[PDB]
């Protein structure tokens, strides 16, 4: 059903790839060019660490839930949970 999740959420337009990274930074979920996107997965691993440090240092009780980013060319979100994380890249379609 994880491949069913892959198909159903990649059928959503704008999305160029459901490349979801774990807590370990390992490509547990990648559908695109993996040496290209594993660098970016390691980046956004370090910057999910930045965002969780941001939340837990600015506020004691707050928990990081979700992130919204508008880039120049596309619309990319970040979905963190308490144990593991998510990355996906979408265009304005």
């Amino acid at each position: 059903e994880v491949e069913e999740t892959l198909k159903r959420l990649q059928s959503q337009k704008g999305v160029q790839g459901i490349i979801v990274v774990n807590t370990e930074g390992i490509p547990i979920k990648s559908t695109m060019d993996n040496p290209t996107t594993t660098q970016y997965a390691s980046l956004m691993h370090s910057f999910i660490l930045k965002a969780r440090s941001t939340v837990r240092d600015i506020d004691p009780q707050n928990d990081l839930t979700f992130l919204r980013i508008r880039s120049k060319k596309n619309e990319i979100m970040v979905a963190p949970d308490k144990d593991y994380f998510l990355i996906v890249i979408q265009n304005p379609t």
């Binding site: 999740t5 959420l9 979801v20 593991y84 998510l86």
Partner: protein, 36 residues
């Protein structure tokens, strides 16, 4: 790193709420906003 370890952790009793909230929040991001 290995397929055995992945299919362990994927079918482990940890990713249940993880897949649930993954699908839920990605579907929650399906509502399109406009910028015109």
């Amino acid at each position: 790193l290995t397929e055995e370890e992945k299919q362990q952790i994927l079918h482990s009793e940890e990713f249940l709420s993880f897949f649930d909230h993954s699908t839920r929040i990605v579907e929650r991001a399906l509502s399109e906003q406009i910028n015109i």
